[PDB]
């Protein structure tokens, strides 16, 4: 059953990535309580697959906005050099 | 009683479960034999129909 356990390890890795991403961006957590809120389905597998897809989406936005910032810096350099008689 | 009554319940559910699974395997294998009956009967019937229509 280590296939499921390895899947769980991947789930933990994705959630840890989300945790670091929110901590850098200063996004708090509610963390109210209600500890016994615990089902045991098989749909959680698909749920966390969807969450992994959303995490891949956020990763793509990161890896793209870095390039957008680089491009904007180059284009602002062009704007700067365009000030000269 | 509670001990031997539980033993009886375990034996009952065990024999019920295996009866289910094993009978169901038997039914499926019989159904496979039936589909293969169709296969053989088709093959032999057509191979005979060739000669039948030749003669007629």
């Amino acid at each position: 059953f280590v296939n499921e356990v390895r899947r769980c390890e991947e789930m933990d890795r994705k959630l840890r990535f989300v945790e670091k991403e929110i901590r850098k961006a200063n996004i708090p957590i509610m963390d109210t309580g209600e500890n016994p809120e615990v089902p045991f389905p098989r749909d959680m597998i698909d749920l966390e697959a969807n969450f992994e897809k959303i995490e891949n989406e956020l990763k793509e936005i990161n890896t793209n906005q870095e390039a957008l910032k680089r491009n904007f810096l180059e284009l602002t350099e062009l704007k700067f050099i365009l000030r000269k008689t | 009683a509670l001990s031997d009554a539980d033993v009886q319940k375990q034996i009952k559910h065990m024999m019920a479960f295996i009866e289910q699974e094993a009978n169901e395997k038997a039914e499926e294998i019989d159904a496979k034999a039936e589909e293969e009956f169709n296969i053989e009967k088709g093959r032999l019937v057509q191979t005979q129909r060739l000669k039948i229509m030749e003669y007629y």
């Binding site: - | 001990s3 539980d6 319940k9 375990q10 559910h13 019920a16």
Partner: protein, 49 residues
């Protein structure tokens, strides 16, 4: 648990006694847990001691 999932399970919990040594437990509370921990930090003894 059987009522939630009706998988035709009588849920039988029998009992047995063997040579294996049982574990040891002592229920604590708000003003006795640290003391159980003090005893445990230096060692835990036999069963029903």
């Amino acid at each position: 648990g059987t009522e939630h999932s009706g998988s035709t399970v009588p849920s039988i919990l029998n009992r047995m006694q063997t040579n294996q040594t049982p574990p040891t437990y002592n229920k604590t509370n708000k003003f006795t847990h640290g003391f159980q921990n003090i005893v445990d930090a230096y060692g835990i003894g036999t069963y029903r001691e």
